[PDB]
Amino acid sequence: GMSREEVESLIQEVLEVYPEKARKDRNKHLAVNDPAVTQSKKCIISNKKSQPGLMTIRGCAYAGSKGVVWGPIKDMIHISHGPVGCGQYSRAGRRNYYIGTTGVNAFVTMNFTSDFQEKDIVFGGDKKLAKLIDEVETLFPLNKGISVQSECPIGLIGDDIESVSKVKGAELSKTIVPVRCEGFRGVSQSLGHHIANDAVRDWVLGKRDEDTTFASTPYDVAIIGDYNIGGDAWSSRILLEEMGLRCVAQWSGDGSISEIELTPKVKLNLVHCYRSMNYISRHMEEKYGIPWMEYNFFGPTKTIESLRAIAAKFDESIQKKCEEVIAKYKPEWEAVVAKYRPRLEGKRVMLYIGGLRPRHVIGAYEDLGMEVVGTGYEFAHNDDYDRTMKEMGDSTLLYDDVTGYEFEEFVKRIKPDLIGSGIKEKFIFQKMGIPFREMHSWDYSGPYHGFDGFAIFARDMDMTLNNPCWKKLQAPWEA
C-alpha cells in the first residue's frame, strides 16, 4: 500500500483543484487513519454542510425519514406531502422487505402523495391534507395508521400539519403522525432519522404505556435499526430465536405499528444501525428503563461475538443455546470461507456508504481475507468515526461527505480491486475497469446479515471481483 506521507500528499494534490474556501473545508473531512486514536475529533470533522457545487452524494432529511425509517413500516400509509417528485423518485427504491398484501393491508411499495400544485403552494395544503386523509380512509380501510412526511415547501409556506393530524386523528380514532422532515432542514439524511425518531416518540410509542395485557417474558428483545434490505432482519431474527430469545419488534424493516407500540415491553433493545436509531434507544432507557446494546451481524466473526455478547445479558440457558447455535452454523460458514477466501484473499476494498456499513462490513471482508484500504460515510457524526478508526488499519484513507471528484481521484491513485458504494457511483467505476458492488441495495442480492447472508456476500464478492468481463476493457489493437 501507501506510506502515511504518500496518502497525505494524495489529499493535498486532490485538494489543489478547489477554490480556497472549498479547499480549507474539504481538508478537514479527509484523514489518514491512526487506529490508536479513540477520539475521532482529532483527525476528521463530520456532519457539517456540504460545499456548493461539489457533487456530494448526500441525500436529504425526507429521505432519512420517509425513505429510511417510516417508509418500511408496512401496515401504515405514509404520505409524501409536497410536489410529485420526491415520493416518485423514492418510490420502491429501497429493498426494505416485508410480508403483506400490498394495496390491501400493507402499502410499502406504493407512493401516496398530495401532489401539490400552485394553488396549494399559494394558499396552503391543510384543507387538501384533511380531504386526503378521508380519501385514504375510504379507499384503504385496513390501514392501521398514517404518517405525513413533509417535503420541502410545507414548512416554507407555513402549513400546520400537526393541527390537521390531531383533528383528523380524533375524528377517525386513528394515529396520524405529522413528520417535519423537509429537505432543507439539517445537511443530509441524518437529521431525518432524528426527526423521525422524535415523531415515533411523540405520536406512537406511548400508546400502550397504561396497557398491561401484553404477556411478556424474561427473553423479550427488539431488533432496533435493521431495515431488512433483501431480508437481512429476517436472517438476523432467526438466529436470535434459535438462541432462545423472543423478538417482539423489528424497527422498521418488516415492521408493524403494533410491534412498535409493544417495544416498551421488551427487556433489551438490540440496536444494529446506531446512527439512525440511537435517539429512540436513549429515550426508551430514560423513560422505560430498557437497556440497549450495539451489535454486528456482518460475517461469522462479528456474528459470533454479538451472539455471545447478547446471550451474556441473560441466563445460562440462553448462553448455552448460544453455543448450540454457533456449533450448528460452524460447518456452514467454514465451508463458505474454504470456498471463497482463496478467491478473494489479499484483495483490497474501498468503501463509501451512508452511516453504518462503512465500518460494520469490515469484519466480513477480513473473514474472506480482504483488506479495507479505504472507507467513509456520507452523513456520519464523530461518534461513528470513533467507532471506525479502531476497525481500520494504519495509514488507510478516511473520507467524510466525499465529492465525486475526490472519490474518483482517490481510486485512480489507490487502485483498489473492488469498490462498494451506491448507485450514483457504480457506473463510474465499472467504466474504469474496477469491480463494483452496490453496498446499499446489495445489487439486488442478499441478505448479507447473519450466517445465511455471509454465504451470499461471499458468493457476490467473488462473482463480481473475479468476473471475466474485467479483462476485456482494452481493445486488443491498443495493447
Binding site: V84, Q88, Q430, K431, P447, L473
Partner: protein, 522 residues
C-alpha cells in the same frame, strides 16, 4: 441454512420451512394482523365497479403517479449540450434523486450538481450558494457551460436566478462570458416534461435573444430538430440516421446520446458529444425548426416562432406509419431533398411486417400510459395495426391534448371502446384493468405491480405488462431501443405480436389439457 454449493438468495431462501415458521410466529405474536378472510374480502372489493367509482371521486389523494417533477426534465435537457454541467439551484436531496433515477434507467453515470441550499438560505436566500456553487463547480468539473434549474425550495422562497447569476459574474466568482443559461422549473407546476421545455427555452434564449440582428432565416440551409424529453437512445439515433440518409443538413438541439452511452474502456468520461454552443448560436439561421414532441415544447415553439421567425410545421411525433410518412414529406418539403429509395424500402418493409402479423394483432385490447406525445403516437400506431386502445392514461396530459387524442380515436373503427384519461394515476388505471379487462398493458416498470394485483384475483384476470416508456428499471438495456420512425414502429410491432404469441404458448403449454393448440407454426 445454506448449502455452500447451491447458495440461495432471498428468493428462494425465505421459502425454507424454518423461515416460514418464524415468519408465522412474528405475524401471530406481534403484528396484530387483520384475518386473511378479511384481507381476501377487501382485495375483492378493490377490484369492483363500486370501488372504481369511489376511486375516481378522489380530489386530494394521488396514489402511484405517472409523472415526475420539472427539474428532472431540465437535467436531461441540459445533459444534451457539449461539456455542460446540469446545476440545480436548491436543495441537494433533489439532485441525489434525479441522478439515481436516471442511473437506474440508463445504467450509466449521470453527472449533476447542487448548491446545497439549507435552512439558512431558506430565509436569507441562496445567493451565496450560487456564487460559491458556480465557482466550485467550474473549477472542479471544468464544464464549458453550466445550465441552471431550480428545486421547489428555491421557487417557494423566491430566489432571483437572473440577479444571482449576474452578481456571481460581477463579484468575480465566474468569468463574464462563461455561459450560465437558466430556467425556473417549479415542481408544483406541470411535470418533468415542462422542465425540459423551460430549460431548453432558457438555453435558446441565452444564445440568441440579443443577437437576432445578423440572423437570416434559411441562410445555413439546415433544419433544427428539438427532441424533447426523450429516454431511448435509438430515438435520437434513428432521427439522425434518417436525415443523413436523405442528405438533409440538420442540427439536433439537445443531444444526450453520447454521454448516455460512453464505452467501458478503462476511462470515465464525465462529458461526451452533445449539441455545441455554436450550433445553438447559429440555430436562428436554419430553414425551420421541427419539434418531435410538440405537446410539451409549447414554450419553445413560442420562442422559435416569435424570435427566430421559423414557421414551425404542425407535425405529430414521428411514430407509426402515417406520422413518419408525414415527418419525412415535411422534411423533404423544407429541405428540397427527395425521400431516397432506401427510406421508401424501409417503409415497405414495415408495411410487410404489418401484413404478416395482422391476424394476431387484430382486435387486441390495450391499456397504456406515458407522456402525452409518446401516448398519442402509441395510440395512433395501435389503430394502424387494428388493435383497440381501451384505457389511455396520461397523468400529465391536458384538455387540449385529450381533445386531439379523442379526434384520432374517432377517425377509426378501432377507437370505439377507447376512453382517454388525463389527471389520473396508476391506482385509477388498476381499477380500469379489473373492471374492463384488456389483453395487455403498455407502460413502464411501475406497471409490474398492477399485473401482480390482477394475477392475485386469478390467472384468467392477469393482465401482462409490455414495457415501453420511462422509467424501465427491472429489465436491462431496453433504453437502447427505438420507438420513433419506421425503425421504432418495426420494434414495437415485433414486441407486441411476440408478447401475444408468448402468452398464447403459456396458455396452451398444459399437457393433455391445452396443448392441442400448442402449434409449432404461428
Amino acid at each position: 441454512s445454506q448449502q455452500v454449493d447451491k447458495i440461495k438468495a432471498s428468493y428462494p431462501l425465505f421459502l425454507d420451512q424454518d423461515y416460514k415458521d418464524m415468519l408465522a410466529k412474528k405475524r401471530d405474536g406481534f403484528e396484530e394482523k387483520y384475518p386473511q378472510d378479511k384481507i381476501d374480502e377487501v382485495f375483492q372489493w378493490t377490484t369492483t365497479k363500486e370501488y372504481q367509482e369511489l376511486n375516481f371521486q378522489r380530489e386530494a389523494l394521488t396514489v402511484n403517479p405517472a409523472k415526475a417533477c420539472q427539474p428532472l426534465g431540465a437535467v436531461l435537457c441540459a445533459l444534451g449540450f457539449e461539456k455542460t454541467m446540469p446545476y440545480v439551484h436548491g436543495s441537494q436531496g433533489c439532485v441525489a434523486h434525479f441522478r439515481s433515477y436516471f442511473n437506474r434507467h440508463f445504467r450509466e453515470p449521470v453527472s449533476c450538481v447542487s448548491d446545497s441550499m439549507t435552512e439558512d438560505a431558506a430565509v436569507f436566500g441562496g445567493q451565496q450558494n450560487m456564487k460559491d456553487g458556480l465557482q466550485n463547480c467550474k473549477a472542479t468539473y471544468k464544464p464549458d457551460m453550466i445550465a441552471v434549474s431550480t428545486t421547489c425550495m428555491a421557487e417557494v422562497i423566491g430566489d432571483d436566478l437572473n440577479a444571482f447569476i449576474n452578481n456571481s459574474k460581477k463579484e468575480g466568482f465566474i468569468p463574464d462570458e462563461f455561459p450560465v443559461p437558466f430556467a425556473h422549473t417549479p415542481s408544483f407546476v406541470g411535470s418533468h416534461v415542462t422542465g425540459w421545455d423551460n430549460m431548453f427555452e432558457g438555453i435558446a434564449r441565452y444564445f440568441t435573444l440579443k443577437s437576432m440582428d445578423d440572423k437570416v432565416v434559411g441562410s445555413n440551409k439546415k433544419i433544427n430538430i428539438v427532441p424533447g424529453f426523450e429516454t431511448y437512445l435509438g430515438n435520437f439515433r434513428v432521427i439522425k440516421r434518417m436525415l443523413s440518409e436523405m442528405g438533409v443538413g440538420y442540427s439536433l438541439l439537445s443531444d444526450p446520446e453520447e454521454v448516455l452511452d460512453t464505452p467501458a474502456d478503462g476511462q470515465f468520461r464525465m462529458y461526451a458529444g452533445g449539441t455545441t454552443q455554436e450550433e445553438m448560436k447559429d440555430a436562428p439561421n436554419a430553414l425551420n425548426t421541427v419539434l418531435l414532441q410538440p405537446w410539451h415544447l409549447e414554450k419553445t415553439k413560442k420562442f422559435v416562432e416569435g424570435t427566430w421567425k421559423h414557421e414551425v410545421p404542425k407535425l405529430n411525433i414521428p411514430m407509426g406509419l402515417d406520422w413518419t410518412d408525414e415527418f419525412l414529406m415535411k422534411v423533404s418539403e423544407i429541405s428540397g431533398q427527395p425521400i431516397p429509395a432506401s427510406l421508401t424500402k424501409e417503409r415497405g418493409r414495415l408495411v410487410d411486417m404489418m401484413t404478416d402479423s395482422h391476424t394476431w394483432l387484430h382486435g387486441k385490447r390495450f391499456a397504456l400510459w406515458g407522456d402525452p406525445d409518446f401516448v398519442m403516437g402509441l395510440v395512433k400506431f395501435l389503430l394502424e395495426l387494428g388493435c383497440e386502445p381501451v384505457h389511455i392514461l396520461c397523468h400529465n396530459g391536458n384538455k387540449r391534448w385529450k381533445k386531439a387524442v379523442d379526434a384520432i380515436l374517432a377517425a377509426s373503427p378501432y377507437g370505439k371502446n377507447a376512453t382517454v384519461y388525463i389527471g389520473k394515476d396508476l391506482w385509477h388505471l388498476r381499477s380500469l384493468v379489473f373492471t374492463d379487462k384488456p389483453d395487455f398493458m403498455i407502460g413502464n416498470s411501475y406497471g409490474k405491480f398492477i399485473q401482480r394485483d390482477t394475477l392475485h384475483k386469478g390467472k384468467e384476470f392477469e393482465v401482462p405488462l409490455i414495457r415501453i416508456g420511462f422509467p424501465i428499471f427491472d429489465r436491462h438495456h431496453l433504453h437502447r431501443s427505438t420507438t420513433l420512425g419506421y425503425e421504432g414502429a418495426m420494434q414495437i410491432l415485433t414486441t407486441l405480436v411476440n408478447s401475444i404469441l408468448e402468452r398464447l404458448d403459456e396458455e396452451t403449454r398444459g399437457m393433455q389439457a391445452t396443448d392441442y393448440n400448442h402449434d409449432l407454426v404461428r
